[PDB]
């Protein structure tokens, strides 16, 4: 169990700015397209809790995806899977077959049929007024949280200035996910003030649990506070 | 060569959106963008530690940057002002060594 956050528990945009950070580092993660791949199989591993995949994403020909633990890795190792996730490159560590490259966390599901787009609605609350909503669509019945968070953060970044080069329309806020059984959890939308330079792996590692949910039922809520 | 800036000279107009482009062939993770002005010396505007990353130097205001790939680092003046008339230098680096380009003379009217 993980209780909804208080105002003073959230990272602040102005703190990130006054410790000299560049919010655009976070902007890029969510404007930039995701790594995707349908029905792929891992070619190798680096450490035993990651899986390396052949993939085409801009100029990169493979992706290391990291999992929270070995057993998670073994769960996808050698099987036919879909990948959907947020790549990073700075601080990425991926040795050649025989250093730098493309990395991400989690993002894996088993490749099945699944096929029809499902629509999910995201309710946005700003300074405590529920004033906006927008839909995202995925075609996976079981979908990782990453795929949903990304598409939701993408929209808000394109349309509501969630992340700008040097700040944001907002000061703070979080994305809350509530499953059919009423368990729920959230993610602070903004970086820790100490996270300068921006180290992507410490921001993306929340996707490492490779958490997977039912697209038909998942509830999605975003809460934001302006200055 | 090693570090190639582009264009070498450029005139532009107040309110114009300019992109100075920089290209390295050294496979260096780190790239920098400075302006030179006779008052001050080189002053660092933005730098970058890898693809996808940008961090602020000492005088980042009114500028933005993008590192869309290993080899390329771009400085971007959003809405240009005459006070951004200057010579701009790009550098890649590793450890203690810094490899500068030939510079970019930009005048803003």
Automatic annotation (TrEMBL), chain A:
Indicate the segments forming the Staphylococcal/Streptococcal toxin OB-fold domain, all copies.
Answer: 25-109
Can you tell which superkingdom this protein's organism belongs to?
Bacteria
Keyword list, A-Z = Disulfide bond, Enterotoxin, Signal, Superantigen, Toxin
Q: Which GO terms describe its cellular component?
A: extracellular region
Q: Which residues form the Staphylococcal/Streptococcal toxin beta-grasp domain?
A: 120-223
* Cross-referenced Gene3D superfamilies: 2.40.50.110, 3.10.20.120
Q: Does the keyword Phosphoprotein feature in the UniProt annotation?
A: no
> Which one of the record's GO molecular function terms can you name?
toxin activity
Disulfide cysteine pairs (residue numbers): 92-103
Please give the family membership noted in the entry. Answer: Belongs to the staphylococcal/streptococcal toxin family.
Name of the protein in question? Enterotoxin SEG
Give the organism the record lists: Staphylococcus aureus
From TrEMBL, chain B:
Which keywords fit this entry according to its UniProt record? Adaptive immunity, Immunity, Immunoglobulin domain, Signal, T cell receptor
A GO BP term here is: adaptive immune response
Native source species: Mus musculus (Mouse)
Q: Does the keyword Lipid metabolism apply?
A: no
Q: Specify whether Signal is a keyword of the entry.
A: yes
Q: What is this protein called?
A: Beta-chain
GO CC list: T cell receptor complex
* Portion of the full-length sequence here: 31 to 144 of 144
Cystine pairings recorded for this chain: 22-90
What is the superkingdom listed in this entry's lineage? Answer: Eukaryota
What positions does the domain Ig-like occupy? 1-90
